């Protein structure tokens, strides 16, 4: 959850790409991997900082192959949700089972059984929405919900949350 840490990445380069610009090319391949990466082990990688200060270790030459393996260590900021935390997001879609909330690079789902009794789904408005005795929820709304479970995908992270404690919901 917004943590800065050092990550080591091993990059293989063909010996043909050995000119002075190779560094830049290598950096490009770094920009095509860290961005959009989502691994359960390290969570979701948010950004990489200090591009000009990136230090690359001496490349490793395979015993027989001509490829060069460079181990680059870089400081990067990553995001990873944890159970019991509360985060705010925006409703992206509505469904009978509930409404999905986009928060950061991730999605959150709220179980119907864990919803306020007053809150009730209604299809009389286009698009369908939810009506509460003291709150209003629509597609364009900032909703703060507590995350109770996390699911890790190959390249995605899903959260399961609920709104039962006070001060939750629309704000």
């Amino acid at each position: 959850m917004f943590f800065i840490k050092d990550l080591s990445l091993n990059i293989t380069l063909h010996p043909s790409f050995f000119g002075p610009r190779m560094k830049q090319y290598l950096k490009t391949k770094l920009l095509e991997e860290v961005e959009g990466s989502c691994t359960g082990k390290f969570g979701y990688i948010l950004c990489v900082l200090d591009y000009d200060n990136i230090d690359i270790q001496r490349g490793r030459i395979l015993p027989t192959d001509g490829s060069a393996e460079f181990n680059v260590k870089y400081r990067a900021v990553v995001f990873k949700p944890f159970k019991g935390e509360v985060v705010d997001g925006t409703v992206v879609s509505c469904s009978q089972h509930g409404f999905e909330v986009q928060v950061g690079p991730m999605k959150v789902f709220v179980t119907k059984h864990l919803m306020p009794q007053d809150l009730t789904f209604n299809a009389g408005s286009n698009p369908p929405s939810y009506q509460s005795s003291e709150d209003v929820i629509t597609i364009k709304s900032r909703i703060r919900v507590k995350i109770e479970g996390c699911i890790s995908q190959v390249s995605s992270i899903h959260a399961i949350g609920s709104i039962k404690e006070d001060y939750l919901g629309a704000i």
């Binding site: 050092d6 920009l31 959009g36 591009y51 159970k83 019991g84 404690e165």
Partner: protein, 159 residues
């Protein structure tokens, strides 16, 4: 199992390793500091690309979007969504405010995650803060918690 009771995983230890092997204390950041570091990284990337090639909620969003498109644009569509999420409901817009906030949070000396949550999440009552983080119950005095909460509320930018 990971939860809010400080039972971090095998890798989220209180201490972190450095490139030189030195051991340091884990450091966290808030939304404003995250945006600041992201902007600095984008500026550095833009400068690197330029040198290599050489030889109010309405205008800032457009500038950020065009900057993202110019560098590291098109590789993934999730970056734009994350940037919009961070920018739409941010709290601090000035570097001085976030600097003061982090300096004040440093004096507390609490866990980085707890201070990050306090600086990011908004609270108004002691009971609400305690129930929000039951683990951090017998760690911060009520008077200190109230003082830091009111200081954070006052430091909030008026957009």
């Amino acid at each position: 199992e990971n939860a809010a009771t400080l039972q971090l995983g095998q890798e989220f230890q209180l201490k972190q390793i450095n490139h030189q092997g030195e051991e340091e204390e884990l450091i966290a950041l808030n939304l404003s500091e995250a945006r600041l570091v992201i902007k600095e990284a984008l500026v550095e990337r833009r400068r690197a690309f330029k040198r290599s090639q050489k030889k109010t909620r309405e205008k800032e969003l457009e500038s950020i979007d065009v900057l993202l498109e110019q560098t590291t644009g098109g590789n993934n569509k999730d970056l734009k969504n994350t940037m919009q999420y961070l920018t739409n409901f941010s709290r601090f817009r000035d570097q001085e405010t976030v600097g003061a906030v982090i300096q004040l949070l440093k004096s507390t000396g609490l866990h980085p995650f707890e201070v990050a949550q306090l600086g990011s999440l908004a609270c108004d009552t002691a009971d609400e803060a305690k129930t929000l983080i039951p683990s951090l119950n017998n760690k911060i005095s009520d008077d200190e918690l109230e003082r830091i909460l009111k200081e954070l509320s006052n430091l909030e930018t008026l957009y």
